[PDB]
From a paper:
YpFabG crystallised in the presence of NaBr (YpFabG NaBr) diffracted to 2.85 Å and contained a homotetramer in the ASU, with electron density visible for 832 of 976 residues, with disordered regions between residues 139–147 and 185–206 in each monomer, and was refined to Rwork/Rfree values of 0.214/0.248. Despite very similar crystallisation conditions, the YpFabG TMAO crystal displays P42212 symmetry with a single YpFabG monomer within the ASU, whereas the YpFabG NaBr crystal displays P1211 symmetry with four YpFabG monomers within the ASU arranged to form a homotetramer. Conversely, this helix-turn-helix motif is completely disordered in our YpFabG NaBr structure. In contrast, a greater portion of the helix-turn-helix motif is disordered in the YpFabG NaBr structure, with little visible electron density in this region. Furthermore, the loop joining β-strand β5 and α-helix α5 within the YpFabG NaBr structure is largely disordered, with superposition of NADP+ bound and unbound E. coli FabG structures indicating that Ser138 located at the start of this loop region must move ~3 Å to accommodate the nicotinamide portion of NADP+. A single phosphate molecule is observed within the same location in our YpFabG NaBr structure, however the presence of this molecule in only one monomer may not be sufficient to induce this active conformation. The only obvious difference between the two tetramers is the presence of the loop joining β-strand β5 and α-helix α5 (residues 139–147), and the helix-turn-helix motif (residues 185–205) in the YpFabG TMAO structure, which are largely disordered in the YpFabG NaBr structure. These regions appear to alter crystal packing, with symmetry generated YpFabG TMAO tetramers packing in parallel, and the helix-turn-helix motifs of each monomer packing against the same motif of the symmetry mate, whilst symmetry mates of the YpFabG NaBr structure appear to form crystal contacts primarily through helices α1, α2, and α3 at the corner of each tetramer. Overall, the structures were similar, with an RMSD of 0.35 Å over 205 amino acids, however they also contained some important structural differences.
Ketoacyl-acyl carrier protein reductases (FabG; EC 1.1.1.100) are highly conserved and ubiquitously expressed enzymes of the bacterial type II fatty acid synthesis (FASII) pathway, catalysing the reduction of the acyl carrier protein (ACP) linked β-ketoacyl molecules to β-hydroxyacyl-ACP thioesters necessary for the formation of saturated and unsaturated fatty acids. FabG enzymes are members of the short-chain alcohol dehydrogenase/reductase (SDR) family (also known as the short chain oxidoreductase or SCOR family). The refined structures of the two crystal forms of YpFabG reveal that the protein contains a typical Rossmann fold motif, comprised of a seven strand twisted β-sheet surrounded by eight α-helices. The YpFabG tetramer is formed through two types of interfaces.
Residue numbers in the entry:
A (entry chain C): 1 to 138, 147 to 183, 208 to 241
B (entry chain D): 1 to 138, 147 to 183, 211 to 240
C (entry chain A): 1 to 138, 147 to 186, 207 to 241
D (entry chain B): 1 to 138, 147 to 182, 211 to 241
Write the structure that this text describes.
């Protein structure tokens, strides 16, 4: 039904998919915390969220930042019940024209970050015997490797914390052409109490590709 | 979301998952029609459906049976907007000891039925620019073949009727039935318009 | 590896992939029996096979037919060691525009056939503790369903007869030339590898030959 | 077919699968270079390789090492035609008990290494218009992510360099000799148009 009494962290909630997710969760009773890469972005997030949430600044590759953002949340609101990973980026290049910087930046931002954010919130989720982790994954050998890693990670973890009332899934948009409104609907369904027995799943929202 | 003035046909709605699916749909406003193998089972479906629908007998292997029931549905209720295939069966056996009867009966009941019933409700769905087709697929070479076929059928058909406002999906449990209904109700709602050709697994890890 | 002293049944070996497969087994020592829907086709198969095999007419939808040819093979050659199913057809149509027959012919020819032919040769393979079952699967809801079913059948059966020394696989070519995905020869190379003694513990697999698309 | 006139680089060829792969290649005419993390391992690799190859020390996470080893190969033998990645490791732990050190050690060793080594040999493979890249992938959220990434990487790269006469595949074990047979087939001229595939050798699991 509704997310009355649930705290949701939506990384990269500045616009598009991230924002549509955040806006739909709040409408259904959730207290939503959206993040951006800059402080400017965060203020914009705090604006459209109002008092139904707050906008923070987050560097998903920086462990020091991940600790700071969560501590802020645990202090002012409480423990995170829902985690939505949507802070992915791209650095397209053919294999030979792709520098190690571009490869490692994607692995760190799109894959490694999901391991860090999951690990940080897993303690509290197990204690509440409830948890939702959802990752948004839509010359790209680096992006493809990360996208695949996230799926392998989620399915493994999904089995590992299955008993504890925690689910770990992935939503795969099309990126008629797709609508961010419908990706949010997909994420909202998974995050609800009607998707308890859905975990380790990759829900595609592409319209039959 | 609510189903408002939509009609849903659920094959195999006597008990378990099929029932759960049917009960969850009427609870959300749909006019639901459940099916059984026996007339005795059909009334039992009508019993818990009440004024919100009706329970009929349908032999999914029988083309005449598919035609008559659908005619009865159009006559007394209307055109099917939501089709939930859950009429599968099993005839387990090792390949060597499996008869042609035991193989062919599974294919006709689990796979071909989905083709017939899908075709029967497809034309009306595209007239309305809306449709939902959801199939429940849970020594089993005969059951295994049909289960895979349904997925191939659904993915192929989904691609064929996508922009006509129709989605074709499969829910695959690890056979609570109530959780299966929640998944089926999500795909059938207006919240899953852009989800088609998907196999939604409900196993929980 | 070689196939000397082996009997291989290739359904639909008239042309293209079916023929390419058949030819490649023969060249590597196999006694190959190729199949067509018409007698004319069977003679054409016996022609290029020479004395390294024979061409027979088989209707994979007819049980009586399947029994007759397999009886002929056991009589004139022996027990089938390797089965390659490639007698599939297509009756393309939009679902709406698809008559039952067109659906049911594909189910009978592309799916049910594999069950019957597998069932008919399985007894011998278990007694020998060796068997190879390979199926060739490349507005097509009828064709798509059957191909998906074949893979479902293969994976189930592969697990069922694993330790009996029998493998059940599927080779999946991208549509081939009758850049490019592959050609009839390269599908044969794949089918020959799975049928060999070097793919003994490969079973329930779907080997795609599309060349990265 | 035989690999006469081919150079094969097999990372982690000290024992088991790695050695089984290396040993089968030299038997079929290939000049094989197996690597180990330690010199003592390298000498052991040089031993069973005999005059059909050589054993070198390699650190798949260290770029400086990768440049030196390849430079040695081109100096004494030539350009690499076949690349076999089997330098994977494991650091098992539950998510809560997995430290950042344990995670990144796997990502660097099992995934990023494949990216580094593939890029280093891609110039010569396209120049020869022939190439073979084969990767072995057999709480483990870190190993699972790396395994999946390799496949996502391989499928992406395979599509990128397909027409260049190069194939990029993955072998997924569940006897080491049979893992070698699979690797040998893909590296041969009979799998020239098999690329971006994950060949499972498990017996059906």
């Amino acid at each position: 039904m509704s997310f009355e009494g649930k705290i949701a962290l939506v990384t990269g909630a500045s616009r598009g998919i991230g924002r549509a997710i955040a806006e739909l969760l709040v409408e259904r009773g959730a207290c939503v915390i959206g993040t951006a890469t800059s402080e400017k972005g965060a203020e914009a997030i705090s604006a459209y969220l109002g008092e139904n949430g707050k906008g923070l600044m987050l560097n998903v590759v920086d462990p020091t930042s991940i600790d700071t953002v969560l501590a802020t949340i645990r202090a002012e609101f409480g423990e995170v019940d829902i985690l939505v990973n949507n802070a992915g980026i791209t650095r397209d290049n053919l294999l030979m024209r792709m520098k190690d910087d571009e490869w490692q930046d994607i692995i760190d931002t799109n894959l490694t970050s999901v391991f860090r954010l999951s690990k940080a919130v897993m303690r509290a989720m197990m204690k509440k015997r409830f948890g939702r982790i959802i990752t948004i994954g839509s010359g790209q050998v680096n992006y493809a490797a990360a996208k695949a890693g996230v799926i392998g990670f989620s399915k493994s973890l999904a089995r590992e914390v299955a008993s504890r009332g925690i689910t770990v899934n992935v939503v795969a948009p099309g990126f008629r052409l797709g609508d961010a409104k419908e990706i949010a609907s997909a994420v909202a369904f998974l995050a609800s109490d009607e998707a308890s027995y859905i975990s380790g799943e990759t829900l595609h929202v592409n319209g039959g590709m």
